[PDB]
Amino acid sequence: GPIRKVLLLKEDHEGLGISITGGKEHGVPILISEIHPGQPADRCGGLHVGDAILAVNGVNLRDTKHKEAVTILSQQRGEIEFEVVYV
Amino acid sequence: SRFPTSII
Numbered sequence: 001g002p003i004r005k006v007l008l009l010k011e012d013h014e015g016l017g018i019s020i021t022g023g024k025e026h027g028v029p030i031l032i033s034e035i036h037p038g039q040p041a042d043r044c045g046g047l048h049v050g051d052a053i054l055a056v057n058g059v060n061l062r063d064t065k066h067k068e069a070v071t072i073l074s075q076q077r078g079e080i081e082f083e084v085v086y087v
Numbered sequence: 088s089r090f091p092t093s094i095i
Contacts, residue, residue, distance in 0.1 A: 034094075
């Protein structure tokens, strides 16, 4: 599908509210496998199961290993911009 | 999951 830019608002006591799978070491993108109900990703409205996360706050995640992506994603705070695509 | 999954 089309590449999309999506804004997520997270408070400091919260996680993102997603599960991710995949990573470069497995030859697949960082993929959203779950959107947890009522948490920030669900509330933002624009992130969905099956979306590949291409970048977050301008940091490319296309070639990142799984744990690299976890570190990068969990570091982001507040108003967080995602670049995603559903394939 | 086919590959590892992390909740974040």
